[PDB]
Protein: 3C-like proteinase
Amino acid sequence: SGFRKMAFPSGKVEGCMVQVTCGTTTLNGLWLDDVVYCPRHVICTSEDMLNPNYEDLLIRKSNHNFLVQAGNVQLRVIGHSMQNCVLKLKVDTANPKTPKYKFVRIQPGQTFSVLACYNGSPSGVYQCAMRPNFTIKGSFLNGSCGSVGFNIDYDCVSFCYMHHMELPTGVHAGTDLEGNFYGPFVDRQTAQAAGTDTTITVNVLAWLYAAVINGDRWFLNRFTTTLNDFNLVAMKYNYEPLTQDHVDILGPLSAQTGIAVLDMCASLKELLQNGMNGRTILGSALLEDEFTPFDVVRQCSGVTFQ
Amino acid sequence: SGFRKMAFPSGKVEGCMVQVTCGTTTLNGLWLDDVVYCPRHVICTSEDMLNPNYEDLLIRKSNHNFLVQAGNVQLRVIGHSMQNCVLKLKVDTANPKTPKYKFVRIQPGQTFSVLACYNGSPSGVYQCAMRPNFTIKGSFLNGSCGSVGFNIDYDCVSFCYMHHMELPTGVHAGTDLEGNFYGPFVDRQTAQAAGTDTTITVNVLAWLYAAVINGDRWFLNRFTTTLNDFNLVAMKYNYEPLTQDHVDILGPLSAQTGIAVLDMCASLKELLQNGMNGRTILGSALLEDEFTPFDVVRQCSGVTFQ
Ligand SMILES: [Zn+2]
Ligand SMILES: [Zn+2]
Structure:
C-alpha cells in the first residue's frame, strides 16, 4: 500500500539535456535527434528582456555562435530557426539517446513530471499540475529556463512543457515544444495577469477514491445528490464544474471501490461545508488536486506495463 | 522561486535494476559491477513467509537457478551468498552502467529518493523520510520488494535502503545494502511493532526557513526563548528534542535569512499552541518534516554543483 505524489523516472530525459549559450547568456536546452530546442530569450541582453524585438534581436544573431555543451562535448551549431517562442538549432551531431519521443499540448488539469536543470545538468524531479489558469506552481531558480516537463506513460516521452518565465506573482509559465505559450503570457519581463486559479474537481474526486482504496472511510457519509446541486456548490468555493465527461473518466475507480461517482460528490459537498479540515485524508489537511484519475490507476494498481 | 518535494533524478539507478526470480517467486534486484543484490525472501515459498528458516531454505537452493532478466538479456547466475537479509549473486556479466556508487546506513530523519519498480522496470520516483521509528511511509504494491532508496548528492549514488516488508499497519520496512534491517523488524510475515512515530523537529525548522525565503512571514512573531522551554513543549506534542547539534546545522539558513535559530523555535512553539492550522505555510496546513536543512540549501539555492 501507500500513496505518494510520484514522478516519472527521468533517466530517458536526462540524456537529452544540454547547456546552451548565446550572445552571452546561458540556459537549458533539449537535444533530440540532432536539433536543440530552447527558449528564444537565450539570445536576449538584459535591457532586452524588458521590451524585446526577437525578430530584430535574432536576424543579427551569429549562426555559428550559439554555444552548446554536454558533459565533455560541445556541439557545433550549424544553424537556426525560431518557432514561435523557441529556437531550433540543427547541430552537427545527433543525440544517440533520442528515445521514442513525441510532442503534446496537454490541457489544464493534466499532470506531468518536471526535470529541473541548472547549467545543463539534472537537479531534481517533481510531479506537478497545469493549473486551470495555465500556470504551474513550481520550483525554479536562476538558470532553470529550458527545463522541460514530460510523461512516459509507456513508450516514453511525451514532452509537454518548457519553462520560460517566473511571473512577478511567483508562479511559472512556459510553452509547449513548438513554442506556443500556455495561457495569456509572453516572454517579456513585464506586467502580466494570470487567471483566478481554481481547484481541479475531477482530480480531487480521484484522490478521494485513492483514499478509500487506502483505508480512508470517515468522509463517506449517508447523503447524496445529482450534479447540479454539487456544481452549484462546487463553484462558490471556486471548483471547476463537473461534467458527465469527468463522470465517465471516474467509472473504473467507481467499479474498483463500489462507490458511485455521485455519492462521492456528496461527501465532497459536505467536506466543503464540514468534514476535511484536520483529521486529514491520506495524511493531508487540504484537498489535493494534483492527481488525475489516471495517476490513481497507474499507481495504486495499474503499475505494470510501462 | 518555489518549493517542491523533489526527488533526485533516477537515471543512474534505472540502469541498475533487474528482475530476479527464484524457486518460483520474482522481485526486484540491484545489479552493480557483476553482483545482484536482492531480498533474501526471494527464495521463500508462501507458507515459508510465515515462519522461514532461511539457512535451511537456501542450503537447498539451486545455484544455477535464480533467474535474472533485464530487458532482452538474462543473467546466468553462477553463484550465491546470503549477507544478513540480502542475497548477493556473482553473475556472468558485469553492469557496464555501474556508476560511482557507495553504500550508506543513514540515520532516522535523513531523506532519500525511492525508485519504485515492478517486474524489474521503473515505475516512479518520490522523496521520502526515514521516520524516527525507522519506518518509511511509502507507496509499494505487490512485487515492489527490492526497490531501492538512494541519494546522488554529487558523484552519484549512495544507496541507503532496500525495501522488504509492508507492515500490517500499512508502513514499510527494509534494510541497508548489507542486509541490516532498519529498526526492530524481521523478514517474517508475522506480528510486529514499530515505535511511536515522532515529528522531526530539525527538519520542520529547516522548512520554516525555506518558507521565509519564499515569502512566508506571518508566523514570525515577537517572542522567543532558549531551548529548554521549547524542548519542554516540543515533546508533549511528540517532537524529537532539539540539540545544539541541530542548531549548528541550521546556521547557514540563519545566516541566509538573518533569523536566529532560537527565534524560529519561538514561532514554532506558538504554532503548536496557535498559528499554523489553515492559513498554510508553503501551501500546506500541516507542518512538514520531510526536508532536511540540507535539502533546503541544495534546492532553493545551492543548486549547481552536482
Ligand atoms: Zn530565461
Ligand atoms: Zn517480498
In short: Chain A touches chain B through 48 residues (CB under 8 Å). The helical segments of chain A are 11-14, 54-59, 201-213, 229-234, 244-257, 261-273, 293-298. Residues 60 and 76 of chain A are 19 Å apart (CA to CA).
